[PDB]
Amino acid sequence: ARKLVEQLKMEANIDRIKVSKAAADLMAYCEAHAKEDPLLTPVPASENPFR
Amino acid sequence: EDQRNEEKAQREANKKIEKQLQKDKQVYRATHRLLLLGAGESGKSTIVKQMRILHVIFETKFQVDKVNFHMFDVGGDERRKWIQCFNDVTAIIFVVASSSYNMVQTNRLQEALNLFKSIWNNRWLRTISVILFLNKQDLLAEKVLAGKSKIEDYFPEFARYTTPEDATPEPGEDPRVTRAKYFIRDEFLRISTASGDGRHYCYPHFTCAVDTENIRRVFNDCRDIIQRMHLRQYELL
Amino acid sequence: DEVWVVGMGIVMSLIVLAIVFGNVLVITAIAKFERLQTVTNYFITSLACADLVMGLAVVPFGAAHILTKTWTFGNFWCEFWTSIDVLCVTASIETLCVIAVDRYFAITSPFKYQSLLTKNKARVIILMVWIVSGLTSFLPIQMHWYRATHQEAINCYAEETCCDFFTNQAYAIASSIVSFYVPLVIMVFVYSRVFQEAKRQLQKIDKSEGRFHEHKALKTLGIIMGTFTLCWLPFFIVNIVHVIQDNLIRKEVYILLNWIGYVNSGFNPLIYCRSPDFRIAFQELLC
Amino acid sequence: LDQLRQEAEQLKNQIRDARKACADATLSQITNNIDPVGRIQMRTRRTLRGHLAKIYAMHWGTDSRLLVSASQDGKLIIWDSYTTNKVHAIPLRSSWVMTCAYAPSGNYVACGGLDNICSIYNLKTREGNVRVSRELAGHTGYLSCCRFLDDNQIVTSSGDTTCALWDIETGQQTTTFTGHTGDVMSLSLAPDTRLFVSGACDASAKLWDVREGMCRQTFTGHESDINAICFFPNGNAFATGSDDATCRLFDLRADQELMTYSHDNIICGITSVSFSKSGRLLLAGYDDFNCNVWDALKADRAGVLAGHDNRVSCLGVTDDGMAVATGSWDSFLKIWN
Numbered sequence: 001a002r003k004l005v006e007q008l009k010m011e012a013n014i015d016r017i018k019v020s021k022a023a024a025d026l027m028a029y030c031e032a033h034a035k036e037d038p039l040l041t042p043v044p045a046s047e048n049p050f051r
Numbered sequence: 052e053d054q055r056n057e058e059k060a061q062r063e064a065n066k067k068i069e070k071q072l073q074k075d076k077q078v079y080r081a082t083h084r085l086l087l088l089g090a091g092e093s094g095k096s097t098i099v100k101q102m103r104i105l106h107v108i109f110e111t112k113f114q115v116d117k118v119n120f121h122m123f124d125v126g127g128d129e130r131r132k133w134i135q136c137f138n139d140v141t142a143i144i145f146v147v148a149s150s151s152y153n154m155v156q157t158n159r160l161q162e163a164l165n166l167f168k169s170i171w172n173n174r175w176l177r178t179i180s181v182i183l184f185l186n187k188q189d190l191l192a193e194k195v196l197a198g199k200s201k202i203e204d205y206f207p208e209f210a211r212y213t214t215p216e217d218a219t220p221e222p223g224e225d226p227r228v229t230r231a232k233y234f235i236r237d238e239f240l241r242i243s244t245a246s247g248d249g250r251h252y253c254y255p256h257f258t259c260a261v262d263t264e265n266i267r268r269v270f271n272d273c274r275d276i277i278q279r280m281h282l283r284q285y286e287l288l
Numbered sequence: 289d290e291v292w293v294v295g296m297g298i299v300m301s302l303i304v305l306a307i308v309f310g311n312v313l314v315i316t317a318i319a320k321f322e323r324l325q326t327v328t329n330y331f332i333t334s335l336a337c338a339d340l341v342m343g344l345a346v347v348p349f350g351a352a353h354i355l356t357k358t359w360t361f362g363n364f365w366c367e368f369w370t371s372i373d374v375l376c377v378t379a380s381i382e383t384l385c386v387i388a389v390d391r392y393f394a395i396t397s398p399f400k401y402q403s404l405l406t407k408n409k410a411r412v413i414i415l416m417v418w419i420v421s422g423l424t425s426f427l428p429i430q431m432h433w434y435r436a437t438h439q440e441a442i443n444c445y446a447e448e449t450c451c452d453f454f455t456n457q458a459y460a461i462a463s464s465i466v467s468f469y470v471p472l473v474i475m476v477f478v479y480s481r482v483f484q485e486a487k488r489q490l491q492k493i494d495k496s497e498g499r500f501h502e503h504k505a506l507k508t509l510g511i512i513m514g515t516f517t518l519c520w521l522p523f524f525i526v527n528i529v530h531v532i533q534d535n536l537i538r539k540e541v542y543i544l545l546n547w548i549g550y551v552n553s554g555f556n557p558l559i560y561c562r563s564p565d566f567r568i569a570f571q572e573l574l575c
Numbered sequence: 576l577d578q579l580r581q582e583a584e585q586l587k588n589q590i591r592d593a594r595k596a597c598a599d600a601t602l603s604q605i606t607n608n609i610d611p612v613g614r615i616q617m618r619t620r621r622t623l624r625g626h627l628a629k630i631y632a633m634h635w636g637t638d639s640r641l642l643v644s645a646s647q648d649g650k651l652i653i654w655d656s657y658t659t660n661k662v663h664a665i666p667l668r669s670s671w672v673m674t675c676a677y678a679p680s681g682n683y684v685a686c687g688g689l690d691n692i693c694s695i696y697n698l699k700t701r702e703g704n705v706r707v708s709r710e711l712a713g714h715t716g717y718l719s720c721c722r723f724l725d726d727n728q729i730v731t732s733s734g735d736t737t738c739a740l741w742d743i744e745t746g747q748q749t750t751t752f753t754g755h756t757g758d759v760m761s762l763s764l765a766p767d768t769r770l771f772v773s774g775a776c777d778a779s780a781k782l783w784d785v786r787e788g789m790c791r792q793t794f795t796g797h798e799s800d801i802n803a804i805c806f807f808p809n810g811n812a813f814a815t816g817s818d819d820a821t822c823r824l825f826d827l828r829a830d831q832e833l834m835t836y837s838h839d840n841i842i843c844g845i846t847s848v849s850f851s852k853s854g855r856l857l858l859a860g861y862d863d864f865n866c867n868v869w870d871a872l873k874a875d876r877a878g879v880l881a882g883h884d885n886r887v888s889c890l891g892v893t894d895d896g897m898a899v900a901t902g903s904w905d906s907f908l909k910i911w912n
């Protein structure tokens with residue numbers, strides 16, 4: 001009863017950020033780690049142990 | 052040369068495991084798996100032990116004519132989402148208490164009817180046959196004979212009762228009790244036949260606690276299920 | 289009569305393309321897709337193999353011979369051709385018998401079907417059956433145990449341009465009995481039992497739930513038995529009768545009935561591969 | 576009582592005035608000028624056979640070389656990806672299983688099912704058949720998923736709307752998480768093993784704290800049951816899949832979803848969701864006998880991963896991002912690159 005109200009009050013008072021910043025951060029991470037992924041960028045047959 | 056040696060080790064170990072799976076596949080193909088399901092206070096507890104102890108989660112083993120069967124209970128879940136793991140069984144056994152129609156306050160039978168209807172139309176259980184058991188025969192007979200409680204008040208469609216033609220009453224039985232029993236049987240078979248589609252069926256049986264012939268009944272029904280499946284496989288039925 | 293001879297070439301040539309196409313399609317469908325790898329489907333694979341040889345090895349040479357009316361190869365080659373023809377013919381029926389017996393075990397013995405038939409036993413049965421087909425086919429025909437005795441026969445063996453079928457009574461009777469007469473009673477008995485079981489099940493279901501609720505089985509059994517009996521029955525009685533008494537059946541009737549017999553290889557895929565799984569397999573590839 | 580309910584309403588009212596104001600511009604507008612990745616084609620490299628029945632779960636090892644899978648015949652098999660040779664076959668006391676996991680150290684393997692017991696096996700035992708070491712009990716409902724937080728403690732989610740953090744040495748529940756109404760189906764751990772999420776059956780996702788024992792936030796974008804959940808490599812996002820064939824990507828910091836993936840040509844369910852090493856590609860299974868590959872930033876299909884004759888119920892992407900493996904009810908496991 002009262003514990004539910006206390007928990008709801010605890011969760012309500014949480015700082016937030018603009019969605020633009022989060023989208024920019026996600027795009028930055030995706031751009032930064034683009035080269036490493038073999039699924040995204042093809043790799044030579046020699047480097048592939050599955051051939 | 053150590054590398055060659057290690058490849059040699061892997062081959063020999065695959066060699067034992069591969070052999071072991073083959074022995075195992077034969078046993079898993081020999082046995083048949085059943086699912087036991089019923090409402091509360093139905094008498095599933097009576098059926099699991101009273102029938103198997105003489106014949107010889109909860110997994111039960113019994114042998115009939117040197118043919119392996121394996122029965123799973125459901126332990127002691129208004130929603131049912133684990134039922135998707137039971138779409139490869141041979142048959143599903145349904146046990147419902149026949150005597151509890153007046154007792155409640157939705158009539159308990161009505162809840163059992165709703166459960167049976169929901170199970171019948173499940174997407175994952177489109178090709179699973181149901182063996183239906185009706186317990187509490189003597190209680191039902193005693194309630195019908197010299198009983199203050201009336202079927203019509205609880206179930207209003209009973210007003211028109213005509214024992215179904217081809218009625219085969221047991222010896223020395225009053226017509227009223229048979230007309231009562233066949234009403235419930237037809238009520239369940241209506242739901243069974245509404246969307247049968249010819250792929251799966253429902254087998255009505257009447258039983259009590261004392262009788263032990265049900266173990267042979269299950270065997271005969273399983274044989275019939277396999278026969279009908281094979282006949283439909285080759286476009287003969 | 290240029291038009292008639294030319295027209296016959298059109299009919300014989302079409303009959304071989306269909307035979308090749310059907311069997312190669314069935315074989316590719318069985319081999320490529322792993323969901324069709326089933327104990328029963330091995331027999332269909334074998335049956336198909338025998339037909340392909342008949343379509344590729346026997347039919348075109350016979351058509352060329354009946355068109356030219358003069359055999360242009362060696363005597364050893366025509367003996368080999370006869371051996372190949374008899375091998376394919378006597379191997380294209382035992383497979384049907386085996387399939388019928390397998391269906392009998394699958395329907396009338398539901399609780400022991402898995403144990404009785406395994407992936408290992410199917411190979412044993414296939415190897416054993418193809419072997420018998422060879423023993424009648426090559427051992428008597430290659431060694432000259434089967435040569436006839438009358439003057440015309442010997443005149444044809446001596447000549448290097450004619451090669452026709454002349455045999456004694458014993459070989460003809462034995463080959464006919466081994467190839468056709470034995471595998472008929474077994475199939476009849478099997479299908480009668482299966483039909484009885486189907487009728488029993490239909491009566492049971494009608495008694496159980498007739499109020500709220502044999503044609504398909506009759507139609508299917510009628511097709512599967514009638515096509516085979518019609519295709520292969522007349523030849524295996526004409527074969528006996530022309531040896532029992534001579535100067536009764538002329539050569540053209542014999543050849544016509546024999547060629548009627550050869551058509552049976554073009555219908556087995558149409559009958560034994562009508563399941564929806566085969567339909568979706570055919571739609572998946574080359575479609 | 577009712578005044579306390581008014582107090583809760585007071586608290587509920589503030590969030591909307593906050594999430595509405597925070598939403599400046601969606602990611603769809605922001606991510607518009609980035610060129611598409613183009614068509615990506617993938618072909619089967621290896622095929623694994625040996626399972627007598629359908630497959631429910633699998634988990635890649637930490638060396639990208641070995642993996643473990645469980646079936647309904649009661650058998651865990653540990654494979655070798657490069658050589659396609661089996662290594663172990665672990666019999667089970669029961670038959671029905673629903674989850675499996677692999678240790679970071681590669682010496683323990685866990686598996687639990689309909690029975691209310693989570694077991695742990697010792698792979699690295701000298702001169703012995705691998706054997707049961709511990710049996711964890713205490714749940715009143717069927718287990719659904721379990722992951723190794725460390726080599727000594729496991730977190731498990733059950734079907735009685737509860738989650739717990741176990742201890743291997745003693746076998747007792749250290750912390751218990753409550754608050755869900757429907758059965759909890761799946762969970763995923765953060766890379767730093769600091770927080771873990773869980774998508775329940777009541778169309779709701781929650782974020783928990785392992786050390787404290789209480790739920791920080793809650794997202795309710797979906798409308799039906801949630802069957803799978805993954806977690807972004809960065810640690811500031813996670814994507815969930817629901818029965819309505821819709822994939823949604825949420826955000827921890829923004830506290831609301833940013834982009835949803837759906838198509839009008841699909842009406843089937845979803846069973847598994849996994850990301851890639853770069854986070855650019857989202858891989859999701861389906862009930863349409865095939866798999867799909869989405870784009871994280873564009874919400875556009877970039878390929879079709881088909882070839883299975885039965886439904887797909889498992890998925891996993893290697894730590895090094897070398898290959899992706901799919902499991903199906905057809906008793907076949909496939910490894911694709």
Ligand SMILES: Nc1nc2c(ncn2[C@@H]2O[C@H](COP(=O)(O)OP(=O)(O)OP(=O)(O)O)[C@@H](O)[C@H]2O)c(=O)[nH]1
Nearest residue numbers: 090091092093094095096097127186187259260261
């Ligand atoms: N007179 C009579 N009583 C019966 C008969 N069959 C069952 N009963 C009674 O019905 C009771 C039903 O309870 P159980 O079968 O023991 O178990 P249960 O409580 O129904 O089990 P759950 O449904 O799993 O909760 C039995 O304990 C018997 O006393 C019968 O044929 N005749």
Ligand SMILES: CN[C@@H]1CCc2c(ccc(O)c2O)[C@H]1O
Nearest residue numbers: 373374377453460463464467527
């Ligand atoms: C020329 N073709 C032959 C002629 C006679 C014959 C065949 C097949 C089986 C037999 O038992 C036979 O007697 C045919 O293949």
